[PDB]
Amino acid sequence: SWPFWVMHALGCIIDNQRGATLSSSIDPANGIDTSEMANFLNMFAAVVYLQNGGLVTMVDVLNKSYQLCDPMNECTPSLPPLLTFINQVAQNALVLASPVVLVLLLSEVFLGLLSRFAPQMNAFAISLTVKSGIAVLIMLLYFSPVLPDNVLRLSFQATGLSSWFYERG
């Protein structure tokens, strides 16, 4: 699932930085109940993976697992790599989303200093109306180059079974 989990969390960052998660999350939700970008990008990344024939790779790791590992040899996960797993998923998503966050902060600072020069001009709403445009324009400009990441960079492969698992644990 790793290639999908990365693309999903990528969405949740954008929805917050752009729009709303309730400041106190008393509701707690905001946006849609699985905010709609993070559901859209999750679906999109899956359909492309199947088309590249990835489905044959998913079944391939299963058969190999049974040959490198089998129940009467008490196969077991490697503890050392499992401890690092959560950072890898977070790090991959954090870097890919970066191009869209930075412009949002810079734009809020642009308006922020303006409320020195026109002080009763409302700081908040004039940024809140605007952000939902700047987020979409900048995503469209990078929508094409996101696809190559799903196919090759993030896709798991049967070669990894040598290090994540060990027998007689």
Binding site: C12, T21, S115, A123
Partner: protein
Amino acid sequence: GNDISLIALLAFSTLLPFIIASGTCFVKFSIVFVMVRNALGLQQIPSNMTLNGVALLLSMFVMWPIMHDAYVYFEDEDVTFNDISSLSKHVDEGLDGYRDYLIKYSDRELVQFFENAQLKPSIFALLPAYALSEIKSAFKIGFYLYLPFVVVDLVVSSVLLALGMMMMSPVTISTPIKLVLFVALDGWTLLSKGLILQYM
């Protein structure tokens, strides 16, 4: 084989998801993760399915050796019995493998109170006496992880007032800084190691 020795198999596997929810360390690990997520601002990052997944795997390392040991104990063919009471004590001798684990973390004064209320140690007093201590331990361990994020919010909010930049909302700015500061330092590894090391 023996029919009453069969019914106990089916009952156990029916109760198993509720036992793991109280009589196992799964309680402490999963809780600490959700509080750390909560304090980072963004919500459902990682997804709930991540957190409850790793907590489930990491916990098996601590409990699975105990379970395996309980069954291997009963398999010895060399034992013999002569009375009903002789059987009860022999069975009880098997559970000591698990009891000894609960006794370590559960607080003495809770168990002693329940062991008295039980009338008019026993596992039924060690389950609730254990569940309450593993909960409590998490609110302590977590509170120390809120301190640095509070500092980050106060600093930037004060910086904003030094620039004289009123009614900007000091959340857009600070949310991403917490993640970069925490993710760039591999916080999730240091956190996970600190948990397993208490029990392994």
